[PDB]
């Protein structure tokens with residue numbers, strides 16, 4: 001049983017989402033001024049804008065409890081991996097705070113950490129415009145692990161056994177479980193060495 | 206630059222996010238076009254079958270090569286960069302996003318279930334460039350979320366699409382100067398911009414050591 005709340009200034013972007021419920025909240029609901037302003041220029045200089053702590057604080061005050069796991073996507077986060085997804089799969093309540101612009105004032109996470117568990121994480125080594133796509137990835141990876149819901153995968157094949165003059169590897173038609181398991185292990189080894197040598201403790205290309 | 210992206214998926218509704226996030230100015234200027242295609246348009250049968258049992262046995266289903274082959278035959282040309290998300294892919298990184306941002310035509314083939322029969326990519330690779338990539342070390346249900354990430358990372362690097370007409374980033378702060386007992390680091394308000402840059406560099410150094418020692 002899991003509840004997921006996502007907070008964002010682009011609730012429309014979260015559209016791609018019994019044991020689990022997902023709710024999406026417009027951060028601007030917690031603004032007061034007429035312009036509904038969520039950002040301001042950075043202290044210390046630099047390009048762009050920073051999301052104000054005040055609006056975030058009010059939103060999280062309402063949505064979070066001390067049991068909440070607050071997830072904050074950021075390119076400067078700890079890596080979000082399958083291990084993380086397993087860890088989070090047994091949580092009762094995830095709140096995902098999606099930033100935009102240059103990000104969220106650091107005091108939002110620091111304040112939250114005084115009363116709940118906070119996790120700043122990155123889904124990969126590339127740059128996005130905001131946390132929303134990361135939220136979608138995290139939700140998908142976690143929800144498929146919720147109770148009641150090493151080597152790279154090798155290639156898969158289905159019918160027909162010959163297509164455009166390309167044959168399904170004959171071993172896969174042999175019915176020999178041991179030979180098939182061995183061939184699959186070898187394809188996975190080839191793939192992992194070639195594409196992800198770091199997974200086997202080798203230098204990255 | 207002008208980029209066309211075609212996405213093929215059995216869940217086209219999953220991609221409408223991307224089409225919405227695109228600035229009208231970039232579309233009107235013909236800088237970008239994203240089109241999403243339902244794979245079932247290319248099925249052969251009244252049951253609109255896209256999957257079948259795996260040769261060699263095992264769990265799950267495999268997407269059919271004949272359906273995918275027809276879809277890609279129609280959509281791709283010799284100039285296409287065919288992107289195939291897969292957890293067994295080469296890592297998709299910012300370097301990748303930069304490389305792909307100058308392409309004229311990306312086609313993203315989104316799999317589901319166990320993935321796509323390998324002959325689809327292998328056949329495509331004999332007449333176009335094919336890239337099997339993964340967006341990270343976690344398992345998804347299919348390629349659609351990966352497509353969203355790749356599209357966003359690539360398009361924001363295409364001149365015009367964003368507009369205006371190594372180390373980890375450190376913390377950022379804005380008003381108010383004090384909030385819930387927490388003060389913005391005073392150095393940031395000091396007007397000593399050389400010292401501010403050094404402070405930021407050290408914050409970045411510390412964060413990289415703590416969160417991403419692999420980058421060092």
Ligand SMILES: CN1CCCC[C@@H]1Cn1ccc2ccc(-c3n[nH]c(N)c3C#N)cc21
Nearest residue numbers: 073074099122123124126128129130131134
């Ligand atoms: C661009 N713009 C200036 C520099 C830094 C980032 C900023 C955009 N931005 C704002 C909030 C926010 C949250 C997550 C991500 C994100 N990018 N890449 C990942 N793997 C991410 C995660 N997880 C990016 C975000």
Ligand SMILES: CN1CCCC[C@@H]1Cn1ccc2ccc(-c3n[nH]c(N)c3C#N)cc21
Nearest residue numbers: 290291316317339340341345346347348351
């Ligand atoms: C689960 N199910 C059985 C095992 C293998 C994967 C499969 C699901 N699935 C089918 C097509 C497909 C494409 C990409 C991804 C994907 N997962 N994680 C990434 N970083 C990905 C990328 N990029 C998963 C996909």
